[PDB]
Design a protein around this ligand. Structure first.
Ligand SMILES: Nc1cc(-n2ccnc2)c2cc(O)cc(O)c2n1
Length: 124
């Protein structure tokens, strides 16, 4: 049984649009999305479909690029740092659930390096 996915809207949370958050959607997320190793990370982990019944017994703060994308489209974040923290949660979850050298880990590590290159310089 999968948990509910992370929220992509919250009326109690203030919204904001910044140049940096626009960039994280238009440039960073949409470039990572096209990477050959992006597909495992484009939606929440379906533990039922993927036959990973222990996934959410281990990962208690799930995050994925589909959720991040919807948050960016919703102007859900206050600032770029909040969105960057969601990317880092996504990568860290993969490294927690899996072991060094696993195929999925190699995929996450390549995306993380590309992510860090793209956010090295943000607009002002
Ligand atoms: N051991 C695995 C297998 C995955 N997977 C398997 C088939 N498709 C994705 C997987 C997918 C993710 O988004 C994150 C993970 O931490 C995963 N870990």
């Amino acid at each position: 049984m999968n948990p509910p996915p992370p929220e992509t809207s919250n009326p109690n949370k203030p919204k904001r649009q910044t140049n940096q958050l626009q960039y994280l959607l238009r440039v960073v997320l949409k470039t990572l999305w096209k990477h050959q190793f992006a597909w495992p990370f484009q939606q929440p982990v379906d533990a039922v479909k993927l036959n990973l019944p222990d996934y959410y017994k281990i990962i208690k703060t799930p995050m994925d690029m589909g959720t991040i994308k919807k948050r960016l489209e919703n102007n859900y974040y206050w600032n770029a740092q909040e969105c960057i923290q969601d990317f880092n949660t996504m990568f860290t979850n993969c490294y927690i659930y899996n072991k060094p050298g696993d195929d999925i880990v190699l995929m996450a590590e390549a995306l993380e390096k590309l992510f860090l290159q793209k956010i090295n310089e943000l607009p002002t």
